[PDB]
Design an enzyme around this catalytic site. Sequence first.
Site, PDB file in Angstrom:
ATOM      1  N   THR A   1       0.767  -1.198   0.153  1.00 15.85           N
ATOM      2  CA  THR A   1       0.024   0.045   0.055  1.00 15.85           C
ATOM      3  C   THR A   1       0.798   1.288  -0.200  1.00 15.85           C
ATOM      4  O   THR A   1       1.612   1.212   0.715  1.00 15.85           O
ATOM      5  CB  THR A   1      -0.847  -0.102   1.306  1.00 15.85           C
ATOM      6  OG1 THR A   1      -1.795  -0.971   1.107  1.00 15.85           O
ATOM      7  CG2 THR A   1      -1.689   1.100   1.179  1.00 15.85           C
TER       8      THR A   1
ATOM      9  N   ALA B   1      -8.164  -2.216   5.977  1.00 16.05           N
ATOM     10  CA  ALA B   1      -8.832  -1.800   4.971  1.00 16.05           C
ATOM     11  C   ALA B   1     -10.202  -1.433   5.351  1.00 16.05           C
ATOM     12  O   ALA B   1     -10.790  -0.348   5.176  1.00 16.05           O
ATOM     13  CB  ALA B   1      -8.749  -2.505   3.867  1.00 16.05           C
TER      14      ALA B   1
END
Lengths: 233, 232, 196, 212, 200, 247, 212, 233, 239
Positions: free
Chosen positions: E1, E49
């Site tokens: 990420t 997330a």
Amino acid sequence: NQYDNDVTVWSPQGRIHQIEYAMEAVKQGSATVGLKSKTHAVLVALKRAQSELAAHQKKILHVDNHIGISIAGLTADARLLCNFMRQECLDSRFVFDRPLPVSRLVSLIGSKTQIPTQRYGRRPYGVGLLIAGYDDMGPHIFQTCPSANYFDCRAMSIGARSQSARTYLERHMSEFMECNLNELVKHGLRALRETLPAEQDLTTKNVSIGIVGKDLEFTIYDDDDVSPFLEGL
Amino acid sequence: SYDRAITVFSPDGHLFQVEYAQEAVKKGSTAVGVRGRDIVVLGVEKKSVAKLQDERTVRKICALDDNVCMAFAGLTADARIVINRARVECQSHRLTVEDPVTVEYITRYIASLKQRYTQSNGRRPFGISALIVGFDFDGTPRLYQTDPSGTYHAWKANAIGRGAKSVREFLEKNYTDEAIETDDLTIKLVIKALLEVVQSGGKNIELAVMRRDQSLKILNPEEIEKYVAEIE
Amino acid sequence: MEYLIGIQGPDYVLVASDRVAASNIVQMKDDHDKMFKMSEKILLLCVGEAGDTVQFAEYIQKNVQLYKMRNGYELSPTAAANFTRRNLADCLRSRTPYHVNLLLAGYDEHEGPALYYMDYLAALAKAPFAAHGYGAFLTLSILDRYYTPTISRERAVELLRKCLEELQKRFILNLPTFSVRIIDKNGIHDLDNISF
Amino acid sequence: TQNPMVTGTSVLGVKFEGGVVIAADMLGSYGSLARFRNISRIMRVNNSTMLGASGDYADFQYLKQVLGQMVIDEELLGDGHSYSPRAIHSWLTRAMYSRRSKMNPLWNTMVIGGYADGESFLGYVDMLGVAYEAPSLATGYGAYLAQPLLREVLEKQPVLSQTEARDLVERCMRVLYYRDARSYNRFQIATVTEKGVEIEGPLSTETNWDIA
Amino acid sequence: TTTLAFKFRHGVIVAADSRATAGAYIASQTVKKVIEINPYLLGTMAGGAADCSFWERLLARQCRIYELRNKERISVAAASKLLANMVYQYKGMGLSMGTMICGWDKRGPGLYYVDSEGNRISGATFSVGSGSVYAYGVMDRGYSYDLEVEQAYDLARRAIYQATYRDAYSGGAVNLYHVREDGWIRVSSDNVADLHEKYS
Amino acid sequence: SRRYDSRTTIFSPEGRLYQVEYAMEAIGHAGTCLGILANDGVLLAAERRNIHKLLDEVFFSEKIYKLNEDMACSVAGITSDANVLTNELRLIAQRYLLQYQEPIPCEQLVTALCDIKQAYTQFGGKRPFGVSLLYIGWDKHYGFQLYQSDPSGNYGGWKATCIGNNSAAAVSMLKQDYKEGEMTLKSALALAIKVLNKTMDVSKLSAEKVEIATLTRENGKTVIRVLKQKEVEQLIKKHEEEEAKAE
Amino acid sequence: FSPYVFNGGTILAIAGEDFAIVASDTRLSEGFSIHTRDSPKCYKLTDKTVIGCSGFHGDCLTLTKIIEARLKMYKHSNNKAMTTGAIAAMLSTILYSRRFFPYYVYNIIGGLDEEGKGAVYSFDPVGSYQRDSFKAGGSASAMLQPLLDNQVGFKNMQNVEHVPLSLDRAMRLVKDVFISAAERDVYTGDALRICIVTKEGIREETVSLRKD
Amino acid sequence: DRGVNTFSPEGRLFQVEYAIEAIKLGSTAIGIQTSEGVCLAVEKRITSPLMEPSSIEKIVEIDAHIGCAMSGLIADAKTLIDKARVETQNHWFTYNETMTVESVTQAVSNLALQFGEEDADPGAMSRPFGVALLFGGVDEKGPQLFHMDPSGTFVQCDARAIGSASEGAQSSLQEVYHKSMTLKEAIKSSLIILKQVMEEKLNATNIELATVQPGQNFHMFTKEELEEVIKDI
Amino acid sequence: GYDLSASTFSPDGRVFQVEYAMKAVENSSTAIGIRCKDGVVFGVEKLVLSKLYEEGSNKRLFNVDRHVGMAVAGLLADARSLADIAREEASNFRSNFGYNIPLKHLADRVAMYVHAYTLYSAVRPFGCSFMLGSYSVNDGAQLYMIDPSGVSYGYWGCAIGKARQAAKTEIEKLQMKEMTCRDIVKEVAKIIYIVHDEVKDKAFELELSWVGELTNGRHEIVPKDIREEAEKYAKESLK
């Protein structure tokens, strides 16, 4: 004079005026009619003209896929009571994965409605309900009152001028158990029409019809859907 | 817990305890606020000076935050609960927003608290009204008034307390753009309105003026006689 | 670790703190204020665990500002440090303790300059000079060496500069800039940042 | 139950044409000790539902009184609505699942059998609330030692008779006595049909042949 | 990420990758990691997330309740403080977060990194995630405050690109947004396999 | 039950609180208590009510109840409700010291009791405390102070005030023989005995019918000292003789 | 005591221009054994929505009871059925409400959206929430996603025409990829329910796979 | 003398019966539902000239698609229109969809009759709400308009006037409304009826108008926009 | 004003709200129960108000445990409330002691729940009397009756309702101590019809339920083959 303000006060005649005044609230609402055959159970209600410009009410409510109610009295006490009934029908299908029986729902209402009729500072539920259902035992027309007992009815009507319907229903109750679906609804429409002023008639705008059956979930019928039922009356 | 409905409706749709809390406002000392262009002036009418007050601690113009200050009329003890609970909310709002309050925000907090005791169990309404003045971050001056009902309005000028029906009749005929032009002429508009209500007359009032940053300061007694001599 | 330092003079409470807001290996911010003014004359310098240093310091800030609104006068530095110790001590056995290491500094009109030390275990101590962090190990003996109780504020900046040059040579973290500000009788004045 | 104390072993169950037969041995072990050698681990729930459990026998006696009194409460009001065997299996799934989420499980591994509306029900419930239905069931080491024998008969022939399912039950219970250390030579056979639940008496695997 | 955000003269550029991976197996490569919150303010998704996407949705409904009660849009300062206070109540419980609230208020362009560890700090440039250290370098060499709009688009794509080239957990497509004074705009969704043909 | 309730915390149709105004008349027939601020101290001069011949002398005073190292009160009204209030002020005075390590400022102690008193006039359905009570004290911010707190929950700072029986006549005498910024302590003790003669219906004073406490500063420490019987008998005789030298 | 068990199962929603295809295997497992061979992981929610749930089957049974209960609560209070995107938004909040003791369920919503196109919503067990065109979840999800990204996403293909996915080419692409999953994943292979959602309702097929 | 939860002998539940009489002292609000949008127009009832009229917020945003119009005790509405705003955001949070106009009215009217004085909550309502609310907005069913009497009785209306002059403005709404008129013709019709019923001279300071279209969001008219409409009347 | 609360005695020491609540039982139709040598037989004169009610609505005979039955009379919503209380007490007894609750104890646990609403202004007394009846092999046949005051006495025959005094004279001339349960049902139906007024209250449906040795101590409704053979017997002696 001094026996009518509280629900925990008996009168000297063995009588609770605050309960009887809440039953006066359901006799001055709007006429709703419930009846059953050996196959179906039909709720017919007058969506009352508040004014000449109001989409009138909604007076038949979905409770489960096999139970629906019809409202006479305070409408905000009704859906407060209906959200209990909707939760009590979801409670059984979550736990037992089966439809809760209609006679056991109304026994849960009458034990929940009796509790404010005995404690201080609480009022009775000023609402009458006609309850249509289809359990494994057949169709059911339970009526409940603010005086929290309930009544398994062959047919029943509650609301304003509803004795004219009970006059009609008790005459033609001898033939309800051998009707078709469209024949049974028209008996409820002729009972509901008996509760009208002479200047008024059953349009499609002021009539709701709730039907539950064997191979039929509970459905309410709107303005355009009551037109196949009013086509003979 | 004392759970009993104190404020209930009556026939003709009146809340008696709300109406009777507003009669407690009309028995209180008169408070006047007007709103200038870059100045807001609060003035209360001291009924009695008595030569024995420590006057520092019966002042009816408080200070809610650095930018917001209010003046009340009514039950003095009920006000101090409202003044303190507004001061806690003005500090919680700096905690979570990283900005000083607007004047309408703390007016909404005071009005919704005053509404809450007209509808909660076991409580009487506050017997106060509150003239709230302040300044935005944009710099626009604000003047608000809460009632015991919980209703609040913005005002160009307003008066609460005793005789406020006559002070508001005065201010509705003397509030113009010319009298709200000079900052000193705005201060004399409150003093002229108070001297119509002070039935004994003289330098027996209290008055606080708040301009912008370099904020609120309550005027001294000899600094108030300078204006009263300029209107004699 | 982040770095605090305070030096009390005869009439000033000169404090300094680093301006870094590091993470795992990278650092985020290079101009990070670790000083929280509570009144016109008191500062709270706060380092410690992530998030606790603002959830505690802004909590102390909103109650010391509330004290001034309710009362019309400000708290003294001794009363503010004692207030700060209470709600740091009765939360150290709570469900949510704060891991903040503080450095409270303030001027009183009648008591004078005041510097306070407290650690995450809420032990308040008034000091002539104090420091926090791993850099305190290298600088608390610069200050045991050249500090006198009658030091000028020009010589306190110059003594502060000796401590911050010691971190540049001998300490392993990169602490290039330092917010420096004085707390004399006229309030809090932001001095120039000692940078490298 | 953080730790079980007196456990039962494998409970069998297989449905046939006209009902369900379950079987469990009459023994509760306290950790490789055949301590209570005469305990029935099969519950007659109501007229169309039977129940046998492995796992902690104290948690099973808790289920016998909570579910047993729930059968009184429906039979009091007398409206003609009974619990089906899959209503009881769904209640017991929600009962065992709510206990593991408070991390206080009931240790048992019930087998619910039943016959209602002309249809045979056979349902598994685990202590984690894992539940399903199957033509044949076996808990414990029966899932290792008897369930292969049950499925190899039900694959060639998906419908058994009553005499054929009972013989398959006794043939799998003999394998459990040979190869499960926690098993025992006395077992109850219960059978639900249209005529109700019938728990037969202490049966033995006494035709055991051991050529050594 | 890898998420990326810098303030410059013409607003604040927000950029992110698209790869969501459980362990070493890439679960998706079309993950909208730049969470748009409302038409004027937005966040990023770095960390867990579901944690970043719940609490910035719960931020989104409190910014709307703020706008209804106060008749003015919330600032970037107050929005990052509401997000910091909500996730501070679950400190030490396991919220993996770390996000960048972006927007304009009356104070101009605003960018605040908010972590679930408890941090909220201002700053010109930030980069959050596992490939953030590869994005810090390409950013800091190209970054200026007096950087053109097309220039700031270029070095935010390329800083995400160089991070995907070195981080195994960064990949997918870049997702470049731009906060102007009249709300954010979504400017490009260039694939990393498409930028490789441009950057070589 | 709504029948048995008396509605203690509602408004009158004129805007009044009855139980507060009825608690105010419990105080106008209590013991007369006054307080005078001077340039070096504040005093309390309570007229003693329990003046029976067969009463003992147990604890330090009858109606003073020192609250703190630096401040004392004096009560008039319901005797029992005052004991509940004075335990509460001592808790507030020690919760401030626990929280700040400084003594409670005197205006902040009166404000905190007046919030407890206001709270029984607004919610709870209880009767208010029928205790109006004076306050003398010293603090860093304003020095010597004097407060009065009605049962309504509102307070005020005074230079000279009086609660109890014949308080209205006592205030008007304090409006004329008190001089602001000009009262010494010894001048204020003589003003206390002067007021306690025209506001007590008896022929004279005897110091078994009064109780006086003074609060002064001595070397950085506040001393609160109830005057003994001979110290007040000298003040009575200094006024019983000087009244003969003025007629 | 562990409150979890991996029960296996793989789920395969695929969106199209006018359809959705949610598919699963029917094998229920624990450890090295097979509970039952006919237990579908797919559940019809509305007239145009099917959820597939794989993971811990105790949580899979509870969660579909909760969704089916909260499907009705929406219809009672809003007098309409839930749309496919609103079910998937609601499931994102149900999965996060139990976050510090989370559901061990991989969820894939498949249905028709509010414009009549196919909609596939994929879920992490704590409610991370993404609309895709195709998603595998569960035991063989690492096996299925490279072929789905080859034959639907047209990835790593050079000069190949991006044809629209038809109904029949998608259904063969579902069946052929579980044949590849049942070959090399031990948890899949009993049968294969395919819930295929179109404008005319939800057709539901099945096809055999290799018994282990 | 009597409690808050007490039925009349006519079954009317007194405190609600008197909260309805409180609305007849509040200023007049008009709503008209057309097929092209709904319009909400309310008298501000300026008490003093010094009162700034921009603070008389008798029309509020509920969401971007729902606006409400109030009459009666404006302070009592602010707890209902804040529960309205939180319920739309809780619906958006859970379901990612705009909440319908009926279900926002259904949620707010569940708070009416949720009062009492016998352990109804630690903080509970002592009395009913002295407000009528006109919800109006555009949902997936199109433009809708709802009424919210203090009994919790909510009803869909095509055109509805509430307040001190409702009986007389509802007589004027029934004459001029028809089921195909335009929103421009409904804004104009809501001001001829406000002209009949207001005491002061109708200008762009003492009225407050807001519309909800299917295309645009809720918006309230400015001072410059209202000046064009009043010249057309 | 000595009668507006249950927490108020009269000046002659009476709690009128209790005594008004037993006027509510006296306005309800007569329910009788007779304890015999083999068991207990209940019988309710159930007034059916409308022809529109189904045969079995507003049921007055309850099963509170599988061995205990309950015939109520009075305010029927209060009766269904106390039937649930008696079911909970019978349930909690078996969950705590493991056997069927004795009728002595069940009647005393419920009568002390009824008594608990005769003491406070926060509640009113129950508007129903109710008989309980059970059979055991060990305990035998037992019949207790609980008043709205909360007093519970054991009976050989009780007759709560409108025609309370008129039915007690018919039960007193019966000698129930030697008669069997199939003989009492023929007599309970006689006593119900002779106390029913065929002028004031028109329509009525007889409800009968025994509990006795012939059911192995289970409480159940008398079957229609035995019920109709007693209603025919009752009309034949009504002449």
